[PDB]
Every structure is written in C-alpha cells, then in structure tokens.
Amino acid sequence: AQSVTQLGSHVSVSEGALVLLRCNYSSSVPPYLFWYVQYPNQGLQLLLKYTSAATLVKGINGFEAEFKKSETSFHLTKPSAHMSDAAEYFCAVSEQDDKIIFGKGTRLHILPNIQNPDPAVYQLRDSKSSDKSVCLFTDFDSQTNVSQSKDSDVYITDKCVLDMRSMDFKSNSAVAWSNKSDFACANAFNNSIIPEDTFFPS
C-alpha cells in the first residue's frame, strides 16, 4: 500500500449519534488495514484490523469497520457516541511487505446533549490576593463557540467539556483573563457570538 487518507484533522459528532470516521487507501492489491486510538496523555491502542479474513471486522467496544475494495475504504463506526470516545484515531495500512504506515489522524469531538442550557459569565477570585481574578463563560449548548481574543493582553481559552460523574452532568466552559486595568468580565467575551440570554450577575 502506497498511502492512507483520513479526511478532517478534527471532526464532531452529537452525543448519542452514529460515529463515522473515514479512511481510504491507495494500493492496487488489498492491504492489511488498522485503526488505532490514542487517549490524551497516552500511547496507541489497536481497536481493530483487517487481515483478509472477515470483511466486517468487529473490535473492542462496539467498534466495527467494513473493508470495501470497490470504494477503497475501511471506515470506522460505532453505533452511539459517548463522551469517553473523545480521542484521536488513526487509520493505518501495510506497506512494502515490511511496515505499517499511518494516516494523519482525526480527533473526535463529542458535543454533549445539553437539554437545559443556562449560559452565564461568572467572575472568580484568586484564593490568595493579589486580588486577581478570571472570567468563566459556562453552560452554553453546542451552538455556541468561543472566539479567540483580538486584544493581545486578554487571554481566552478554547471551549472545554467536563463531565461531572457525581451528578451525571456535562457542561461547556471557556476561561478569560487579563492583567489589564480596564478588563471586566462583562466585556471579556465580546468577540464571541454568545447566547442572547447569557446570565451576567448581579
């Protein structure tokens, strides 16, 4: 096998929806094919592989992939996306009868199903002081995305999903902060399109 193509370095799926990560290969003779997963902080784990036996290969955790010679594909699927499926996935191919070659990888982002959004911007104070604080934009659904800062002395993080197991409760948040004198939480996310009913305490 000359090559392997995964398209989209980052992809999204709704929590509970079908997972589909695409892989295509270039190789006139059918190759052996592999899907590895990588959790943040970790190494590589084999999910499944095509080794010229079953065409529908079944892997750990409900993962499966079908080798389709006529469309040179080996797409990875799982029937329902869980928050714990958040990881980078790599498809891979045998080559030159002596090695495995790797796709560039796709990160799967799972958009939590947020039935009751409660968008809000809160101010948090340093536990010592040094009367510093940060601003926390939280509890918006996945129609909101957070834009990067256009003031170089204000820092804004990407949104991040946490899953509180204690209450079976997931939520989005981004953090903003600055040492600037005229920085206020009211203005911190002005460069993002926020929900019209964002709570600004009080």
């Binding site: 052996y32 090695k99 990888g105 809000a120 948090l124 340093d126 170089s152 820092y155 991040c160 305490p201």
Partner: protein, 240 residues
C-alpha cells in the same frame, strides 16, 4: 515485547547529541522508530529486520540508529534542532504485522536553556453568583509563565487524584504569540456540587508537574534554577 523505551521525558538544548533506547523481551526481528507530531500522524524514521539491517523511513534526516542486539534498537538525534521536538515511539512487529508500541518518549529541543521557567499556579474560587444560580461550583486553575510547553496538570481532592468534573485545555496558549520563545499558560476547571464546595473540611489542589532542567545542567542566573518540579495551588471549601 514488553517493549520499553528510555527516557520517558527529556528536555535538551540545540546542538546536542541525544540518544533514545528501545528494548524488547520477545526477540522480534523487526523494530521501528517513529515520531508523532500534531496533524501528521506517526512518521517512520528508521527500521531494522536484524542486527545487520537498517532501512530509512520517510523522515530519516537528522537521525541515525544502531541495532546493537536482537533486543535493542537505538535512535540518535545527531545535533538536536527545535523541529525535532516530538513524541517518539518505538515498536516491534512479528511476521504478520502484530505491532507492539513502547509507551513513548516526549522530547523537547530548546534553543536557549536560559528561557526555561517553571509555572506559577493559582486557584480561583467558585463564584457566589454561580453557586446561587446553579447549585454547582467551578474552580479554575491557572498555570502561567512556563517554558517549555512540557507539563502535566492534575487535580487532587482531599489528598486523592480526581478525573470526574475536570476539563484541562488540550494545549497551552502562548503569552506572547509573536515570540518564538514565548512562555505558556494553561487553564483547568474542576466542577463540584455547591454542597461539596461549601464544606470547609474539603481541600482542593491543582498540581502542575513541570519538566525542565536537571541537576546536571549549568545555571548562571540569580533566579531559581528551573529544574523539573511540582508546583501546586490550593483552596479549602468555604461555608461561605
């Protein structure tokens, strides 16, 4: 094939020869060194089918290897440069593509060790307005002013490590993005019920493991030598 690699983490200055070592117990003929970079996957550097056989992969420039035993396959950066900063993975294979990967080597090449700097870490307490509105409480950890981008952040409640309720930025941001040696910043959140935050018996700590200088490195500055170390910050629960 307990495949083992050493070291696990290393920071080095540019212009140094650096050695990474892979060992296996299963005696597989076939061993491989790969590097992983964001957006590029795992790219093959070199590989070996016996003690007499070495073969280039796609990115062999800047590197050399030695297969000094059935069990051992060494990788060298000849003269380290910053773009060799990466996670490095060795692997073995059997005769039918059964691959075993080692757990990885995180290597950072820096141009100037004088810029190394541990983080300052602060915990920010939950807001009253959050607690009132949601009956939940979000703590924020901020690690700032660190260099290189080579940390691990974790949260510790009453002395034990927690994963639930946590989100940590997947990559740090640059404090001064127009500089090639900008310091970094990273944030994390830990959300608990208001009731748990409200209990003054509960203790919350953000721990940042920093990788920097070793005892062997020369240090000529007045400020603290920026050695590998843990920096934490803490808060207690508050009846209010």
């Amino acid at each position: 094939a307990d495949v083992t690699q050493t070291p696990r983490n290393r920071i080095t200055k540019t212009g140094k020869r650096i050695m990474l070592e892979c060992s296996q117990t299963k005696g597989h003929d076939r061993m491989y060194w790969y590097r992983q970079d964001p957006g590029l996957g795992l790219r093959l550097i070199y590989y070996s089918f016996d003690v007499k056989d070495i073969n280039k992969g796609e990115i062999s420039d800047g590197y050399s290897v030695s297969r000094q035993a059935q069990a051992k396959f060494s990788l060298s950066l000849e003269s380290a440069i910053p773009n060799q900063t990466a996670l490095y993975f060795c692997a073995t294979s059997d005769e039918s593509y059964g691959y075993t990967f080692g757990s990885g080597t995180r290597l950072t090449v820096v141009e100037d060790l004088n810029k190394v700097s541990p983080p300052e870490v602060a915990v920010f307490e939950p807001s009253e307005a959050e607690i009132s509105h949601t009956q939940k409480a979000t703590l924020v950890c901020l690690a700032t002013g660190f260099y290189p981008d080579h940390v691990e952040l974790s949260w510790w409640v009453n002395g034990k490590e927690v994963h639930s309720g946590v989100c940590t930025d997947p990559q740090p941001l640059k404090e001064q993005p127009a500089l090639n040696d900008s310091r970094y910043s990273l944030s994390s959140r830990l959300r608990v019920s208001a009731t748990f935050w409200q209990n003054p018996r509960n203790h919350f700590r953000c721990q940042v493991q920093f990788y920097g200088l070793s005892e062997n490195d020369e240090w000529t500055q007045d400020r603290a030598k920026p050695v590998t170390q843990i920096v934490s910050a803490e808060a207690w629960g508050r009846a209010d």
